[PDB]
Amino acid sequence: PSWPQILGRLTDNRDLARGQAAWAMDQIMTGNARPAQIAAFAVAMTMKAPTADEVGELAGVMLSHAHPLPADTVPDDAVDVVGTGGDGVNTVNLSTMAAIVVAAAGVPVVKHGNRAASSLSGGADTLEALGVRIDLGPDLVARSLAEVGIGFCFAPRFHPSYRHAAAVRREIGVPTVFNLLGPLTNPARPRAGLIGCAFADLAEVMAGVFAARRSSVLVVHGDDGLDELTTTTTSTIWRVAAGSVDKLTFDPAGFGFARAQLDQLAGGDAQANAAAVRAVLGGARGPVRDAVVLNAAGAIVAHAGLSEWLPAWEEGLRRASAAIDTGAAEQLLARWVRFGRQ
Amino acid sequence: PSWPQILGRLTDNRDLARGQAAWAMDQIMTGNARPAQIAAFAVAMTMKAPTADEVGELAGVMLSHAHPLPADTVPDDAVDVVGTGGDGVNTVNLSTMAAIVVAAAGVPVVKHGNRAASSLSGGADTLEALGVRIDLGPDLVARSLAEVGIGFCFAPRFHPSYRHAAAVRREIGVPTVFNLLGPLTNPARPRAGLIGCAFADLAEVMAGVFAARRSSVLVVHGDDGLDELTTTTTSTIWRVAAGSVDKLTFDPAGFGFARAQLDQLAGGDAQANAAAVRAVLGGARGPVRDAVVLNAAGAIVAHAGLSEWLPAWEEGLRRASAAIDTGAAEQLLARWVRFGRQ
Numbered sequence: 001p002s003w004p005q006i007l008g009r010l011t012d013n014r015d016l017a018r019g020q021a022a023w024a025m026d027q028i029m030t031g032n033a034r035p036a037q038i039a040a041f042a043v044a045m046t047m048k049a050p051t052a053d054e055v056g057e058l059a060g061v062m063l064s065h066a067h068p069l070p071a072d073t074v075p076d077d078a079v080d081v082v083g084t085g086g087d088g089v090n091t092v093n094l095s096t097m098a099a100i101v102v103a104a105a106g107v108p109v110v111k112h113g114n115r116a117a118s119s120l121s122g123g124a125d126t127l128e129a130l131g132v133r134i135d136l137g138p139d140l141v142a143r144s145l146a147e148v149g150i151g152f153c154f155a156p157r158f159h160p161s162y163r164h165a166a167a168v169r170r171e172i173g174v175p176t177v178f179n180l181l182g183p184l185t186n187p188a189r190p191r192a193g194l195i196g197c198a199f200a201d202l203a204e205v206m207a208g209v210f211a212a213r214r215s216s217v218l219v220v221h222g223d224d225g226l227d228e229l230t231t232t233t234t235s236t237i238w239r240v241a242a243g244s245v246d247k248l249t250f251d252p253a254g255f256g257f258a259r260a261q262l263d264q265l266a267g268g269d270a271q272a273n274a275a276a277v278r279a280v281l282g283g284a285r286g287p288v289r290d291a292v293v294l295n296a297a298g299a300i301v302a303h304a305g306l307s308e309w310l311p312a313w314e315e316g317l318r319r320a321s322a323a324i325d326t327g328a329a330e331q332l333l334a335r336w337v338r339f340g341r342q
Numbered sequence: 343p344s345w346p347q348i349l350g351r352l353t354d355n356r357d358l359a360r361g362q363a364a365w366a367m368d369q370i371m372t373g374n375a376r377p378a379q380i381a382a383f384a385v386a387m388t389m390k391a392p393t394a395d396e397v398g399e400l401a402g403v404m405l406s407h408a409h410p411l412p413a414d415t416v417p418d419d420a421v422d423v424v425g426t427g428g429d430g431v432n433t434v435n436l437s438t439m440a441a442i443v444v445a446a447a448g449v450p451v452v453k454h455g456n457r458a459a460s461s462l463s464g465g466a467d468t469l470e471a472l473g474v475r476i477d478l479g480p481d482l483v484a485r486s487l488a489e490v491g492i493g494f495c496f497a498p499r500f501h502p503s504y505r506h507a508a509a510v511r512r513e514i515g516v517p518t519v520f521n522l523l524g525p526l527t528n529p530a531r532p533r534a535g536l537i538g539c540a541f542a543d544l545a546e547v548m549a550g551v552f553a554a555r556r557s558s559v560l561v562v563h564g565d566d567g568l569d570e571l572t573t574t575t576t577s578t579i580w581r582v583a584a585g586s587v588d589k590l591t592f593d594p595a596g597f598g599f600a601r602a603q604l605d606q607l608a609g610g611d612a613q614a615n616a617a618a619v620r621a622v623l624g625g626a627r628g629p630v631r632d633a634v635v636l637n638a639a640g641a642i643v644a645h646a647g648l649s650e651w652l653p654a655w656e657e658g659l660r661r662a663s664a665a666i667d668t669g670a671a672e673q674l675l676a677r678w679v680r681f682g683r684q
């Protein structure tokens with residue numbers, strides 16, 4: 001394989017041969033690619049329209065180079081709650097809040113996360129502001145998961161070889177196929193998740209990658225553009241189960257939720273967003289709670305799919321709400337903060 | 343304007359707004375674009391499908407930054423004979439040989455040229471092997487043109503600010519929109535030309551750029567893939583005159599030209615291709631001579647267009663053949679060599 005061969009194929013609008021995307025990614029992640037080659041590949045793959053096979057190869061190479069969690073430390077039914085980001089709306093940290101609630105309902109959560117790329121405060125930034133340790137390596141994430149019920153895998157900590165693509169992605173600015181990879185490369189490799197996708201036309205491709213792994217995942221795109229299940233309108237859900245992908249539209253009104261305005265979900269800096277988390281876990285009613293409960297329920301539905309759509313959602317909403325109302329979610333965050341200080 | 347705005351528009355498969363392509367090219371030419379940005383732009387422009395407007399903007403910026411020739415030193419009827427290269431056939435240097443013959447026939451030639459990128463020996467390489475000084479500056483090119491009847495503008499000498507782009511292009515190794523720019527950026531700005539294009543689907547775009555300038559040009563693509571008028575089969579000609587383009591099919595059988603095999607036009611290294619030039623100029627009969635006379639005639643037809651198709655060709659073929667047969671073409675090369683030495 002070569003860069004002229006692979007780039008030529010992509011610029012002729014042809015799907016790559018098996019292994020070529022993987023060759024390319026490994027060149028990038030071993031530091032052997034020129035910035036121009038990285039850029040050309042990212043842009044060419046994006047404009048050609050990447051396939052699930054190709055994206056699966058890219059994610060596969062990343063996982064092959066990632067720091068793994070130690071053996072037998074991740075429950076077979078662990079779940080992720082994470083998105084691509086890049087929706088350009090700068091909301092409160094819905095995945096992060098949902099993840100805490102889900103863990104507090106008793107579902108093991110091993111969350112992939114990162115700092116913001118465009119938003120004011122990313123999930124890692126807000127957790128940091130809350131006193132949660134976002135710097136833990138493999139051993140300690142495994143202990144967090146065992147002792148607290150949730151572990152946070154800070155992406156740069158687990159994916160140091162991905163640094164080689166970092167400057168190039170920033171310099172070109174524009175989203176590419178690489179913006180699909182975050183949720184696909186959780187180093188603990190949980191088999192269930194509620195996965196946000198900001199890019200409506202590529203969500204199906206992400207879903208295809210999870211289907212090839214036989215993951216139980218809901219890939220979600222709010223029809224208002226959010227990489228979350230939204231409360232302002234319907235959401236599109238690519239449901240992944242038993243290796244197949246089913247496309248659905250989801251309306252929260254079907255479960256008694258009132259329509260919200262997008263500005264009701266607006267975020268701010270790390271301190272402002274940390275305060276927003278504290279308010280929801282404290283039992284404040286309103287639009288931010290509703291969106292958290294909705295997304296937590298989605299994660300629980302994905303979890304249930306590891307082993308029907310309507311009762312699953314009803315049970316998910318019931319469990320997410322109870323996890324907040326009992327105080328369990330607020331207590332879990334406190335215990336998480338205390339685990340880190342120890 | 344910004345790289346994210348422009349790259350975003352292109353990856354959305356949208357034509358650029360007026361002036362955006364020029365903005366981008368000026369950033370590249372001033373050393374202000376990162377290699378990753380250069381590469382992203384080249385690839386995105388190529389896959390979106392460039393317009394004549396866009397390519398014209400890129401060319402315009404290069405000419406703005408190029409070393410010009412001194413005022414009133416280029417004849418108003420000067421002609422170029424040059425192609426994109428990149429046809430992957432590795433032939434003898436047909437444009438270079440044609441240019442010498444055309445000049446010997448009395449048509450002033452200010453040739454844009456460069457070393458090979460893929461071939462074993464490009465026009466510049468073969469001229470160097472013949473003893474011609476290829477790297478002369480504006481003042482001396484102008485003197486060459488007046489005293490010898492031909493001048494050669496070495497692209498890297500006249501377009502020093504293009505070095506950032508040229509480097510990225512070698513790194514990604516695949517043809518892009520930038521491979522159209524050579525024939526479009528002759529620093530002497532001749533108004534006529536015989537212009538080869540290796541890319542059949544983009545020749546019409548090149549022709550459009552020349553039309554906007556109201557040049558008299560034949561943009562040519564051999565139906566065997568050559569960026570030259572071929573003798574192995576028919577050629578497509580985008581004839582540019584009166585600011586309009588019309589596409590023609592051209593068969594040299596109509597002028598008594600026998601079919602050649604592409605193998606008979608095969609080239610080698612600079613010394614072998616220099617030998618091929620000497621052989622043609624020395625009056626050897628055969629497929630190479632035929633191909634040279636045909637392309638020489640084409641340039642003379644373009645020159646005439648600055649002012650009927652078939653009579654123009656007949657006159658061009660007669661003048662080309664005679665320029666060789668009288669030894670005028672051999673003697674002009676000898677004078678060209680002496681000029682550079684003295």
Ligand SMILES: Cc1cccc(C(=O)O)c1Nc1cc([N+](=O)[O-])ccc1C(=O)O
Binds near residue numbers: 084155
């Ligand atoms: C995967 C990943 C690993 C290491 C660094 C980065 C980084 O870019 O800094 C990274 N990217 C993401 C990580 C997550 N994530 O959830 O951990 C989400 C999105 C992205 C992204 O760049 O689009």
Ligand SMILES: Cc1cccc(C(=O)O)c1Nc1cc([N+](=O)[O-])ccc1C(=O)O
Binds near residue numbers: 454501520523
């Ligand atoms: C324009 C130009 C200017 C400076 C350098 C280069 C280079 O790349 O080295 C260059 N490119 C070409 C120049 C000519 N030319 O006729 O002088 C022909 C083709 C090309 C090309 O790369 O496609």
Ligand SMILES: O=P(O)(O)OC[C@H]1O[C@H](OP(=O)(O)OP(=O)(O)O)[C@H](O)[C@@H]1O
Binds near residue numbers: 182196
């Ligand atoms: O700056 P952006 O590109 O817009 O990304 C915003 C955040 O979304 C992603 O994580 P995640 O879904 O886990 O965070 P969340 O809690 O805010 O939803 C990403 O890792 C960022 O932390």
Ligand SMILES: O=P(O)(O)OC[C@H]1O[C@H](OP(=O)(O)OP(=O)(O)O)[C@H](O)[C@@H]1O
Binds near residue numbers: 425538
């Ligand atoms: O390596 P390549 O990409 O295949 O290009 C072959 C040559 O063709 C172009 O010039 P020109 O038309 O003037 O040269 P010629 O005499 O060989 O036709 C280009 O500048 C190269 O010198």
Ligand SMILES: [Mg+2]
Binds near residue numbers: 094196227
């Ligand atoms: Mg999210």
Ligand SMILES: [Mg+2]
Binds near residue numbers: 085
């Ligand atoms: Mg989000």
Ligand SMILES: [Mg+2]
Binds near residue numbers: 424427436438538570
């Ligand atoms: Mg040529």
Ligand SMILES: [Mg+2]
Binds near residue numbers: 570
């Ligand atoms: Mg050629």
